[PDB]
Each structure stands twice: as C-alpha cells, then as structure tokens.
C-alpha cells in the first residue's frame, strides 16, 4: 500500500520524508521509488516540459510506500513501473459482467441475471480499480451463501429475510448486510448511515472503508 | 512522568502461515545461559486449533 | 429506542442457533430489571526500585449480566398464546440444548447473537460460567426470575476472523510443486539416490501470494520443474 | 400447575428407595420459602494478542437448593395423623438412612427422584456436599426449618446407564475364538512350542458384533479353528 | 447410518455432495455407493428405460453415508446392491409374534399372550423395519422388569404402578414409560405429548425420535 501526496507551495522533499517517516534521511529512498532526477521539485511548471516523466512540479502526485517496503529493490522497480496506477495491483482486474445496471436491479435475487459484455471493439471488457471492487461486492451480496459449486459459505442469506416489516427484521437485515460486506479482507469495516422503511419495501444505505 | 509501554509480539515461521500462528500466542520463555552448554526456549500456545497435526 | 416519548420502547430479544440450521428469534416480553456491562482492561502495573512502569496489552473480554422477571398475565404470541411459565421453560430448554451440544470443544456454527434494542448496540455473546440461574422465592410467588451472564466475543457487524476472504491473487495452489512431486514419485530409486548425491555435492560447493508476474518467490518452482524434462543429471536438483 | 386459572397446585414431592423392594415417597405439606436452581457452565475464555478464544466442555452440574418449613397444625395422611414435628423427624430419618449407610453397608437405590409438580420439571438428584441443614430460630417457638442442597444426576426421563441396550446386531460372542482356546488347551507341549515358533516365523517376515453377513470383522477367528482342527503345522499358525 | 435424499429437479451430483459432505471432491466415492453409471442424474425418463437398475432420475431415492463409513469399501459394496434393503438390515429382522393384535391389548401385564403366526406359505411370519422396532418397544413395555430367565433388568414396573389415578401416579407412570422406551440405544429420546385421565382409565400418547 501507499499514501497519496500533493506537492505544496515550493514544498521540500526532505520535509515530506520527515513528515511521512519521521527520519529525514529516508528521502534518498523515496526519490528512487518515484524515479526522479535531481530536480525533485520545481516551482515552475514550464521546466517539467523538458522531462515530464522524470521531473515533478507543484500539484504533482507522489507515491509514499510503507516503511517495510522502503529498501526493497523489487518494490522500487514495481512502483516505478506503475506510477500513479499502483492501486490496480491490489484491487486487481477482472471481466466486467454489469452490462446494464438499469435492468438487473429489479430482478434481484434470481437466476439468469448477469452476463459478460464488450467495451470498445475486439478486446473483451474488463473492470478495474474501484469499479471492480464495487462489482465484486455486489456479486457477493446478490449470490446465495450456498449456491456455487465450490468454496461454500460465500454469499448472503438476504433472500430468506423477506417478510414482515417489523423493526427487528430490519436490524437483522442490517446485521446480515454488514456481515456480508466484512467477509472480504479488502474492506476494513462497514457501518450504517441512514435507514428508511416506508410502504412495504425496505430501504437503506451503507458505507465501507475501501482501502486506498 | 511515568513511561507508557504497548508491547506487540510478532512471530515468523519457515518450514500454515506464520501470521496465523503468531495470533494465538499467549506467552513464551527463553532460557539462554553461558554457564551451561545448551540454550532452550519454550512457547505457550492457545487451544483454538489442533497444533499437533500441523 | 427507549421510552423517550418520540418512539415506543423496543424490548430486548435473543437469537439462538437452531440445531437443524437457521436461528430462532426469542424475544423477551419484559425488559430486564437490572442491566450491567463490564469492560475490563489487561493493563498491568509493576513498581521498579526508582520508577513506576505502566504497560497495556489491549481490550479484555467484556462481560454482560442482567436480571429480570417474566410477565404474569397472558400475552399473545406471533404463533400462539404462551404464558410466562411457558416462555421461561422454553428459554431454559433452549439454553440447555445450546450448552449440551457444545461437547466438541466449540460449536462449529455461529455463537449466540444478542440484540439490544433498548440502546443501539449489537454483540456476539457466549454463555458465561455463571450460567442461567433461576429462582423463585416466597415474595412474588407467581413471578419467575432469571439471571443471565454472558461474555462478548465481538461485534456482530464484523464477520468471523477465520472466514475472511483474503486477496488470494495469482495462485495459492501452484501446479509446479504438484508436477515436480509427481515426477519425483515416478522416478526410480536409483534416480532419487543420484538426485540426493547431486544435492549433497551442490551443498558442498556453497562456499569454500505466488504470481508468475511481478514476483520472485516462485522462481524456484519454475527451475525445480526443469532438470526433469531436460536430463540435467540423472535426476532433478533442488 | 399454579393457583391462577388452572386448578390448585400440587406440592413438591420426594421419592426415596425402600430397602425391601418398591419405593416410598415424601410430600411437603408447606411449599418452600425459597427455591434456587443454579445451572452454571464449564467454559473458559482467554484472549490472545488480537483474537478471543472460546472453549466449552459440556453442561455443568445443575445444583438445586430450596428452603422450607413444616406447619404446626395437623393434616390428613395416608396412614395415621402426623403433625409437622413428626413429618420433619421422618424426613431426617429418611435422609440419614440414605446418607449414613450410603458409603457403608449398602443402599438398594442408586439415586433419588426429585419431582416439581408446581414447576413441571423432573430430575434425578443426589445429596450435595453441603448436605441437609436443620435450624430453629428465635421467632419459631414451634416451627422447624430445613435447608437442603442437591446435585442433578440427569433428566428423569432418560433411562439408567446400566439399563441401556445397544444395537447388538448379529452374534456378540466370537464362538470361533472360544473353541480355538478350548482346543489349544488340549494340545501338548511340543505342539504349543511349534505353534510359537511358527508364529515367530510368520511375524518376522510380514512387511515386504460378530456377523459373517455385511461385515468382515470375524475373518481370522474362523481360520484359527479350521487351521487347528485340520492342522497347518504341528500346532498351527495365528 | 445413512441419510435419505431425493433427487431434485435440474440438480447435479456435485451440489448434492457439497451440501452434505461440504467438500465436492468426495463425490467421486459417493457415486459407488449408489451403483450408478456415468449418467448419474438424467431428467429424461425414457433414457432411464434402457437400464433403470444402473441409473437414477428425478424423484429417486439416494443414499448418503456418514463420513466415517464413506471411505469403507465394505460400506460401498453393501450400499451398491442392497439399496432399499439397507433400512431393513439397519433396523434388523426378527420373527413376528403379533398373531392377535386385537387380543393382546385387552390383557395388559398378562402372561401367555403373544404367539407366533404364519405369512406367505409354509414359513413363520417375520417383521422388519420400523414395524420391528414398534413391536420390540411394545413387548418391552408389556414385559415386566424381573421376569425373564436371562439378562435381567428387562421390562418395566407397569403392573405395580396401578393406584388411585392421582396426578403423581400419572407422572410416575409417564416416567416409567419414558425410561422403558429410552432403554434401547437405537431410540434417541421420548416425551409425552398429551395427558388424559377421566374416570378409571388412563390414556396418553408419546413420540419417539428414531435414528434415520
């Protein structure tokens, strides 16, 4: 993992290293991680035109690796190869199956719902980044707990909770939803924000602390 | 002022994951002495999992 | 919500695990008369000859204890008309069933789920060593009393620690080790002996999560796969 | 039962074992002033660095304790007219008979049956370590108070451990081994010596509910008799 | 022991194995218990017509042995061919002595009542399955405790419990019947369902949880 950073007005790289690591002397590893020449930070943006890849200006994004992976040469190389797109390695890339969100929401828990799709031309569609995490969470929530043919205890028992609109049923649904979301290690935790029960259909929303 | 201490023990194992092994730690002893010709240590583990088979 | 005047009081209800799967939603018709919650800490203090040392190790196991009495007059139920004595007997039967079935160290299924609707909070609990103490003194002859003590395992919001789905990127079950083992098993005894000899010779000459991409941990697996498809000696190496 | 709605409640009764067969019982004329039932659990919780471990080893002993007195006025009995003092004396005599000659001599009954008609519950009980306790206070010129603690052996519905019948499908006695042992007893010294030598010879070069239907447990038993009677060597093998 | 199971519509053997044994890999050995060819489950009825003995379809009964007996070769061999005979063998076989079912009820705790009968042709009648269990339970209840000439402590004290039809005597009779029924290890437990005493006749019923 890492921490995003934005260069302040004529900010100093050594000050950044001291702030994010305590010891000032670790700045030599950070610039190697970012793969920057000696002009690490320049106030003038026009100077970046000469060597945009190897020169950072004010407002330029920077990567702050964790303390453990500071001196790892492999981590340095991988971070240099994936500057500003390092989040994709953790969350990953997967095939996109949410072809149309306007259609499958109404059906809910049932079979013959999702399907692959193609974006652009030729290349099969693949969802990456935060959208991939959201798609995985939605698929996990929609699927039953014991439906798939392998690694059971994957899914949720939401379909069994339809019934009376009494408050205890709502709290049970809330607990089940929180249990389903917390099952993935990529989510630190989750908690409710607001709940609403009007008519005969339950409504609610949740927030999840997505890493990075 | 009185010092504040927050111990945090970590265990690594090389031939089950080491992190899972270190989670169930409860206590350990480490008898090292130059007087005798042997150094010995002991580790106490919880009964959550059957370590005998692992 | 409590009886604050805006919303009606909601009574505490339990949720035990049924033997044949699912859960039974047990609800108290009268809230406990007394409610106590403890949050002990694992902090320890040791006095050195010249200074005090304060050391902490984190939150300790919480304890939940409460006491109350069941109602006297009959009250309707969602699937019948159960009196207070029937409710208390059902509670005792459920507690006995949950306690007796846990003879295998710990039940593989979910623990007891506690739902406190009086104040917004949820917990996963287990039967305390005090257990379900039932008594009925001369005072209030027709009213039962129950005392329950519990220990908190964790918040019901979070799932089980061991059931969390890790990243599992790449391949945790590499085929290289499997086919290397199969080839070694298929080799003759003399071939394995020569492989051991070569390994010993290489050891003498020392001196004097897995992913094919962007990872080096699986380097040995690719090399160990080789030296059998190509006869690098009469047997593999490493 | 109780006094509300349903007919008049039945008093608590105790059943004791009669020496000369049969049983004798004891019904309290006055309900106990206090009645406490403890149902603890044998479970311990210990927390590691970042997790909570819960372990259980079954249900604990259900301790029953209650306190009562005896009315001074008389009341009809199955035989004779016994007042409260006589009833309490008979209770003391029965408890002494169950206790004094329990560890010494012999008592026909292995347990006591405790009936709670008022609570609609039944248990098999034994005298607790605390035992019976009798006292008369300042404010009881004529009344007598008794305090007793009990430990539940188990549910009265279940049968005795010694009176349990297993499945026992098929023959239980391996008659083949019996007749093998019977035949071997008639063998001479040389035959037994040769049998031992043959067993040693076979032993040192090894590695290199009786029912014939739907089972194979009693295979070698039949072979031993056939080998002995026919003769595989002077004494036999296996 | 073995749990009965019925093939569900559009169901696969892998899901059946996963639901009970948890791991789908056990299905390779589970098929040998049922003695089925490669078409383990087929919806088409006429397909099974070619070889009904070595095939299964929707609505048919399967065998689900416990994990301990799953790996036993003897259990596989026995369950391959016996099929429905397993229940009869599991509960045992014994001679039927209910020659006069109408008569033995009129004389409770009376000797010289039961006798052999004849069914089929030229052979003594026999009983098996749940009927055998019920017959054995009835004989045990009727048999007094200390009358048999061998293996004593078999029966009940029902003859001695006649009294003043008072509630305590009724509870004593209930407990005696429960102990008599629970003596056999095959039966799990028992409990009274209804009590009815009117005049000078005791009536009631009980439920027994028989294994499998």
Automatic annotation (TrEMBL), chains A, E:
InterPro entries the record matches: LysM, LysM_dom_sf, Sheath_initiator
Coiled-coil residues: none
Protein's UniProt name: Baseplate wedge subunit
UniProtKB/TrEMBL annotation, chain B:
Coiled coil regions in record: none
Protein name in the entry: Peptidase C51 domain-containing protein
Region of the whole protein represented: 1 to 68 of 808
UniProtKB/TrEMBL annotation, chains C, D:
Annotated region described as Disordered, given as residue ranges: 175-221
Highest taxon above the source species: Viruses
Biased composition (Basic and acidic residues): 179-208
Protein name, UniProt field: Putative baseplate component
Species whose genome carries this gene: Staphylococcus phage 812
Classification lineage: Viruses, Duplodnaviria, Heunggongvirae, Uroviricota, Caudoviricetes
């Amino acid at each position: 993992r890492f921490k995003k950073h934005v260069v302040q007005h004529e900010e100093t790289m050594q000050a950044i290293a001291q702030r994010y690591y305590g010891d000032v002397s670790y700045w030599i590893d950070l610039v190697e991680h970012n793969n920057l020449k000696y002009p690490y930070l320049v106030e003038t943006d026009e100077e970046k035109m000469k060597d945009p890849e190897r020169l950072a200006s004010t407002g330029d994004t920077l990567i702050i690796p964790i303390e453990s992976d500071l001196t790892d040469v492999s981590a340095k190389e991988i971070n240099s190869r994936d500057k500003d797109v390092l989040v994709e390695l953790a969350l990953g890339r997967d095939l996109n199956i949410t072809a149309d969100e306007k259609y499958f929401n109404e059906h809910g828990t049932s079979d013959n719902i999702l399907a692959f799709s193609t974006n652009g031309n030729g290349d099969l569609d693949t969802v990456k980044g935060i959208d991939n995490m959201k798609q995985q969470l939605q698929a996990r929530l929609l699927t039953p707990r014991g439906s798939l043919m392998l690694h059971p205890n994957y899914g949720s028992d939401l379909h069994n909770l339809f019934g009376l609109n009494i408050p205890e049923q709502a709290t049970l649904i809330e607990m089940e939803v929180l249990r389903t979301l917390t099952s993935d290690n990529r989510v630190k935790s989750a908690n409710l924000i607001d709940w609403k029960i009007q008519g005969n259909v339950y409504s609610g929303q949740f927030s999840v602390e997505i890493k990075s | 002022m009185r010092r504040i201490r927050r111990p945090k023990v970590r265990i690594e194992i090389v031939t089950y994951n080491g992190d899972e092994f270190g989670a169930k730690l409860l206590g350990f002893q480490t008898k090292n002495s130059m007087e005798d010709d042997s150094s010995v240590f002991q580790i106490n583990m919880a009964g959550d999992t059957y370590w005998d088979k692992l | 919500p409590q009886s604050d005047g805006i919303s009606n009081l909601h009574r505490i209800a339990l949720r035990f695990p049924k033997e044949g799967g699912g859960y039974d939603m047990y609800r108290f018709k009268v809230n406990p008369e007394n409610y106590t919650i403890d949050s002990p800490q694992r902090t320890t203090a040791i006095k050195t000859k010249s200074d005090i040392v304060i050391e902490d190790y984190g939150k300790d196991i919480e304890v939940i204890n409460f006491t109350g009495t069941t109602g006297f007059r009959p009250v309707r139920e969602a699937d019948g008309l159960k009196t207070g004595k029937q409710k208390m007997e059902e509670l005792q039967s459920r507690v006995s069933e949950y306690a007796m079935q846990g003879g295998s160290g710990n039940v593989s299924g979910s623990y007891l789920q506690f739902f406190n609707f009086t104040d917004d909070s949820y917990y996963k609990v287990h039967l305390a060593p005090q257990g379900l103490k039932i008594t009925r003194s001369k005072d209030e002859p027709l009213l039962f009393r129950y005392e329950i003590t519990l220990v908190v395992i964790g918040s019901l919001t979070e799932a089980d620690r061991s059931a969390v789905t890790t990243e599992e990127f790449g391949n945790v079950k590499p085929n290289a080790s499997q086919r290397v083992d199969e080839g070694i098993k298929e080799l003759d005894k003399n071939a394995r002996k020569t492989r051991d000899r070569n390994n010993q010779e290489i050891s003498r000459r020392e001196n004097t999560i897995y992913n094919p991409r962007q990872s080096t941990n699986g380097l040995k697996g690719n090399i160990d796969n080789m030296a059998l498809i190509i006869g690098y000696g009469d047997g593999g190496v490493s």
